[PDB]
Amino acid sequence: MRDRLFFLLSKYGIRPRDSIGQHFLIIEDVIEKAIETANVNENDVILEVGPGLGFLTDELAKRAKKVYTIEIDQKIIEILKKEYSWNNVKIIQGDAVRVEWPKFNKVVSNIPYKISSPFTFKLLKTDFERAVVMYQLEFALRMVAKPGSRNYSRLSLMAQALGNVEIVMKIGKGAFYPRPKVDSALVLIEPRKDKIVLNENLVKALFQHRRKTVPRALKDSIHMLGVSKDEIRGIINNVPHSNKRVFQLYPEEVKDIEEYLKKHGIIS
Ligand SMILES: CSC[C@H]1O[C@@H](n2cnc3c(N)ncnc32)[C@H](O)[C@@H]1O
Ligand SMILES: O=S([O-])[O-]
Ligand SMILES: O=S([O-])[O-]
Ligand SMILES: [Zn+2]
Ligand SMILES: [Zn+2]
Ligand SMILES: [Zn+2]
Ligand SMILES: [Zn+2]
Ligand SMILES: [Zn+2]
Ligand SMILES: [Zn+2]
């Protein structure tokens, strides 16, 4: 399967990456394991991103009703059309972060690592049942980080606010060409049944400097928006969870800051 990649790459005379965050999955058992973890059946409509040379895509097309696969490289698409004969796959040309997504109930995909963050935020705001995606292990660990831990960040918060996230297994670096410098991780995401929907400008504001207390953080980001300090100082000194640093906040605690600011005219 590494061999099949080498033969496809030479056949079309193409180099195995345009960019730095890109690694082809080349173990059949990790593919079949992503698919079994996702429970892909003949009724499911799947989104995939960065199909590469169609290894995962081919397996998804045997099992699902319909697959949409988003690919940025027009040269890769010409190869997927020549190399495969799928009735039920729709290749979409574009940056997966920018293009409109189709309706899908599931995602099964090895994410190019350069887009791990924007893809994840975009997905969490989507109506899906289940997603099984490959990331770097550090990024996956960031996604399951708990409030108050050192790697807890905007990503962690939103993942916990909107999803249930488990790392299914470590994936060895041996399993990609070219070999990454670190291991990847098979990650399951389901939407929370009881989502905590937070204002994105607020969260962005707060975690611009997640090391600050929540009063410092709110005062700085709202001054930056053009508002007098004196106009803001009182309202923000009565903000809930003021004894916390931003990186210690549960989604539930952000929600109360939001409703407090909403009530006091700041966010609208
Ligand atoms: C899965 S890692 C490599 C594959 O992802 C594709 N790819 C890389 N970046 C993006 C992107 N932003 N949107 C969609 N496909 C991408 C590349 O063209 C390659 O086929
Ligand atoms: O299993 S990882 O350490 O190669
Ligand atoms: O190049 S990979 O290690 O992100
Ligand atoms: Zn096939
Ligand atoms: Zn790091
Ligand atoms: Zn599980
Ligand atoms: Zn100033
Ligand atoms: Zn609190
Ligand atoms: Zn509360």
Residues with CB under 6 A from ligand 2: 170, 172-173, 183
Return d(Cα 87, Cα 141) in angstroms, integer: 37
List residues, by chain if needed, whose CB lies under 5 Å from ion ligand 4: 58
Q: Where are the alpha helices (H) located in 70-133, listed in sequence order?
A: 74-83, 116-124
Structure tokens at 262: 């909403």
Are 74 and 95 within 8 A, CB to CB? no
Q: 200-263: CATH homologous superfamily?
A: rRNA adenine dimethylase, C-terminal domain (1.10.8.100)
Give distance in angstroms: CA of 230 to centre of ligand 3.
47
128, 147, 229 from 47: Cα distances, Å:
10, 30, 46
Structure tokens at 161: 């606010």
Ranges in the chain annotated CATH 3.40.50.150: 2-191
Ligand 1 atom nearest the C-alpha of 21 is 2
Q: What is the resolution of this structure in A?
A: 2.6
What Rg do the C-alpha atoms of the chain give, in angstroms?
Answer: 21
Ligand 2 atom 1: the closest Cα is on which residue? 172
Residue labelled with tokens 């005219």: 265
Ligand 1 atom 5: the closest Cα is on which residue? 50
The one-letter amino acid at 242: S
**Best residue for ligand 2 mutational test, from 136, 183, 184, 186 (most atoms within 8 Å of Cβ):** 183
Resolved by:
X-ray
Backbone angles phi, psi at 139, to 5 degrees: -70, -40
Return d(Cα 36, Cα 208) in angstroms, integer: 38
Query: Phi-psi region for residue 226, left (φ > 0), alpha (ψ -120 to 50) or beta?
Result: left
Does residue 178 have a cis bond before it (omega within 30 degrees)?
yes
SS3 call for 124: helix
Return d(Cα 218, Cα 224) in angstroms, integer: 10
Select from 2.60.40.1220, 3.40.50.1580, 3.30.450.20, 3.40.50.150 the CATH code of 2-191.
3.40.50.150
Return d(Cα 158, Cα 70) in angstroms, integer: 24
Ranges in the chain annotated CATH 1.10.8.100: 200-263
Q: Where are the alpha helices (H) located in the chain, listed in sequence order?
A: 2-11, 28-38, 55-63, 74-83, 116-124, 137-143, 154-162, 200-207, 214-224, 233-236, 251-263
